[PDB]
Amino acid sequence: ADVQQKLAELERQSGGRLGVALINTADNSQILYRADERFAMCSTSKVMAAAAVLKKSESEPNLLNQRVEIKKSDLVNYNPIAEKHVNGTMSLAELSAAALQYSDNVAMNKLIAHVGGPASVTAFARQLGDETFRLDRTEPTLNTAIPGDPRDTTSPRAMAQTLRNLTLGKALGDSQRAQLVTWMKGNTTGAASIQAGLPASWVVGDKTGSGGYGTTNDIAVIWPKDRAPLILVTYFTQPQPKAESRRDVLASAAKIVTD
Ligand SMILES: *C(=O)N1C[C@H](NOS(=O)(=O)O)CC[C@H]1C(N)=O
DSSP states (O other), X not given: OXXXXXXXXXXXXXXXXXXXXXXXXXXXXXXXXXXXXXXXXXXXXXXXXHHHHHHHHHHSTTGGGOEEEOOGGGOOSOOTTGGGGTTSEEEHHHHHHHHHHSOOHHHHHHHHHHHTSHHHXXXXXXXXXXXXXXXXXXXXXXXXXXXXXXXXXXXXXXXXXXXXXXXXXXXXXXXXXXXXXXXXXXXXXXXXXXXXXXXXXXXXXXXXXXXXXTEEEEEEEEEOTTSOOEEEEEEEEOSSTTOOOOHHXXXXXXXXXXX
């Protein structure tokens, strides 16, 4: 396709490795580029962890109100919300919102720990029929994004399908799905990534990620006014361990696949 040559060229010019999966719910069509290759999810794995907690809350009434202690020793590389609550408690709802909307790594660690650890988040993905997702480590090591390392990776195809199932499909109960959508729509970190490649007025819920090797990711549900939504995963990674992030590549991919 023309979109394929455009994604191929975007990738070639970038010098990196681009993974794209788009689902257009209007006709159930997909646009796939390296869609079965594994990419380090980085902070995009936060959606699966928050969704695991949402699922757990369907059978455990008042779960989101459960308090979690924040210690200074819990602080990692990035935790703008949790650092404000050192020696205080945050509810699982507050942790989910911090993880999803501010990409708070301590929040993600508390979500991971709540469900039983990285393997438990992976078990949750398996329960939804996602056989690709794997969460192996906690924050911050889950972001190393070493080329060829399968830890903490998924494929664009798998993540797009899962994200569709979570936000639009029946993977979660009605209220939990609406909650995840609300959390993602309220993301504050996504303006330079997928969103930057879309018409300014479109409603977007997304989760960005960054990591080693200039890994730059974004997973999104896009609701254009008067249209059916799109699910889009754009994963990008580079040859150099200390490569700077390339959110512009995700924005360019978003534009290519949405035009
Ligand atoms: C997630 O990938 N991380 C936590 C935080 N995310 O912010 S981002 O989604 O805007 O990139 C900072 C980067 C990253 C990490 N290495 O912890």
